[PDB]
Design a binder for this molecule. Structure first.
Ligand SMILES: *[C@@H]1O[C@H](CO)[C@@H](O[C@@H]2O[C@H](CO)[C@@H](O)[C@H](O)[C@H]2NC(C)=O)[C@H](O[C@@H]2O[C@@H](C)[C@@H](O)[C@@H](O)[C@@H]2O)[C@H]1NC(C)=O
Lengths: 227, 5
């Protein structure tokens, strides 16, 4: 296993997107994860529809908030997901038009890892790193400091237990800088935000739940490589 | 509830 790794350099990651005034980080992390898993498995990178999730994932609550795993389940259940092109983003709740979509990227299954207090931080870090090496994963996180972030490695700043789950990001890799380990996370607030739309989240900080609770709930789409 | 840009 590499000291560092970054999928955003391997051509399996779409450009950073902008969610606008809609609480859809959950959907962008889900589309982001699906885009990667699909490019890794099949070799084609295509942008996918966050709007279809916002409109069709009835378990979530559209622009108010939602879930990554529920997005993945919906995609398995509905034969796949429409592309960004065929089902454009509007940043507002709309009627589900999934039945009107002719083309879709499909996934084989999906995983979820809900950390328990029986696990240690080391083990949470170990398994997460393992999942990321295989493919980018989506994690829930408390984004209370995000409006303030502009660069460098974020250490949790004002986050504190109990961590709120008000946003999702896409972990695409990890690296180091002067002995400080970090995850490379793709955000969805435009390319001008943070480090070209990404935020480096410090890891191994000691808290089992990680920075702002990002170790808590991981979920990712599963796709068997194409022959 | 969910954060927005
Ligand atoms: C934790 O909360 C602090 C106060 O709510 C943040 O500082 C505030 O940052 C604003 C935008 O960066 C700035 O307009 C405010 O004046 C400032 N408040 C004060 C009293 O300093 C803090 O942000 C970090 O620290 C400040 C000083 C700046 O250096 C920011 O760039 C930093 O991000 C929050 N901690 C974070 C986001 O890590």
């Amino acid at each position: 296993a590499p000291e560092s790794w970054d999928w955003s350099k391997k051509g399996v990651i779409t450009k950073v997107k902008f969610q606008g005034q809609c609480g859809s980080g959950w959907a962008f992390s889900a589309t982001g994860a699906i885009e990667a898993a699909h490019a890794i498995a099949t070799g084609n990178l295509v942008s996918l529809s966050e709007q279809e999730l916002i409109d069709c994932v009835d378990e979530s609550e559209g622009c108010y908030n939602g879930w990554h795993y529920q997005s993945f389940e919906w995609v398995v259940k509905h034969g796949g997901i429409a592309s960004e092109a065929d089902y454009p983003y509007k940043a507002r709740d709309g009627k589900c038009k999934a039945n009107e979509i002719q083309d879709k990227v499909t996934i084989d299954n999906y995983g979820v890892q809900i950390l328990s207090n029986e696990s240690t931080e080391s083990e949470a870090e170990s398994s997460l790193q393992s999942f990321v090496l295989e493919q980018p994963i989506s994690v829930s996180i408390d984004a209370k400091d995000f409006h303030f972030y502009s660069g460098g490695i974020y250490d949790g700043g004002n986050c504190s237990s109990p961590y709120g789950i008000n946003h999702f990001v896409l972990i695409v890799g990890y690296g180091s800088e002067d002995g400080v380990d970090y995850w490379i996370a793709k955000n969805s607030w435009g390319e001008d935000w943070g480090i070209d739309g990404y935020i480096r989240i410090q890891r191994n900080t000691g808290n089992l739940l990680g920075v702002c609770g990002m170790n808590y709930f991981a979920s990712y789409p599963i796709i068997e490589k194409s022959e | 509830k969910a954060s927005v840009g």
